[PDB]
């Protein structure tokens, strides 16, 4: 055992310069020879796993941090929630990228760190709540009910919406067949001044219609209008008699499921949101940590062309750029 200040000094350099496997090797083998890892040691490991988006590794660090009885601070929860948003997901051609992310409940660890942040007394940031909503919403996951309740209390705390969160949450509500929640998201992002959405503003075609949960509550318990409260009319339309309209509602019920049961022959069982949606964080393409990029998609290969950075038969310093 050398100097523990020297042990922390190499841990500072590897989180700052090299990849995520170096801090996981150094802190684990250093804990086994007897280096007492403090909160300063775990925040440097959790900085490197949050940058590369290693969702399985953040769970293993927080299991060792709770075993060593070292209390996390507000900077520690800043890396747990922002690190779950940077996890790899998406679909190559018929190949699921990071399929073991689904069995881990990494959206729930990002939610559990939010509950432990306010219970221990720390102040959560605006990028924690935008990164926690992303983990419920990303194309391997379909959780828009919990992401709606998270966004509802995000406005009550006067948080501002991140433009990456609006891009993911709009595609999740479109995929899960919710146009009222998607039109209200575009209407909200245009009014709050979110960048990239000040031109997209949709009219509220559901202005007179009640909520979808209120109709199911009214249907369990005016009686002619109670059964047809869910039916949407143009104003120049009238309902049928109650025996004739109820036979017509079962016609549309069996016709909608008949169309949705037919597979599209060249989709590999995927929605159009899932097609060509491979995600790695911004570290994979010649970039490093920035705070405003929560879940930043890696830049395309047309940003850096070869033979404009170095001439022919000469090496370029981009080893893993064009590899997706």
């Amino acid at each position: 055992r050398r100097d523990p200040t020297e042990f922390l000094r190499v841990l500072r350099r590897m989180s700052r310069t090299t990849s995520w496997q170096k801090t996981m090797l150094f802190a684990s083998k250093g804990r086994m020879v007897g280096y007492r890892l403090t909160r300063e040691h775990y925040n440097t490991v959790l900085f490197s796993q949050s940058l590369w988006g290693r969702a399985l590794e953040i769970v293993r660090v927080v299991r060792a941090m709770q075993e060593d009885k070292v209390q996390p601070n507000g900077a520690t929860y800043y890396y747990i929630v922002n690190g779950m948003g940077n996890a790899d997901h998406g679909w190559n051609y018929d190949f699921r990228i990071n399929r073991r992310l689904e069995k881990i409940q990494h959206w729930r660890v990002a939610l559990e760190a939010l509950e432990a942040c306010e219970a221990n007394g720390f102040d959560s940031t605006d990028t924690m709540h935008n990164s926690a909503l992303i983990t419920l919403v990303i194309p391997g996951f379909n959780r828009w009910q919990q992401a709606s309740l998270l966004l509802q209390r995000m406005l009550r705390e006067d948080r501002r919406m991140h433009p990456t969160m609006v891009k993911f949450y709009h595609d999740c509500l479109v995929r899960n067949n919710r146009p009222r929640e998607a039109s209200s998201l575009m209407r909200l992002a245009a009014e709050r001044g979110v960048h990239g959405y000040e031109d997209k503003w949709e009219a509220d075609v559901y202005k007179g219609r009640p909520l979808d949960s209120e109709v199911m509550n009214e249907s369990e318990g005016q009686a002619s209008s109670l059964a047809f409260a869910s039916l949407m009319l143009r104003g120049d339309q009238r309902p049928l008699p109650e025996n004739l309209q109820a036979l017509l509602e079962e016609e549309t019920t069996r016709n909608i499921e008949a169309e949705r049961s037919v597979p599209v022959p060249f989709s590999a069982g995927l929605h159009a949101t899932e097609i060509n949606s491979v995600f790695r964080p911004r570290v994979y393409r010649q970039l490093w940590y920035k705070w405003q990029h929560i879940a930043n998609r890696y830049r395309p290969t047309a940003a850096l062309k070869r033979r404009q950075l170095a001439p022919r038969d000469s090496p370029t310093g981009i080893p893993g750029f064009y590899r997706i």
């Binding site: 055992r1 050398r2 020297e6 190499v10 090797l25 150094f26 083998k29 250093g30 086994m32 020879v33």
Partner: peptide
Amino acid sequence: TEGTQEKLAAAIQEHVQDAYRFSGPT
């Protein structure tokens, strides 16, 4: 069977020195 923990400690210490080789000088 009893002297495997100290051998494990020596092996993990050797791995820690191999990781210390990343630091370079001093």
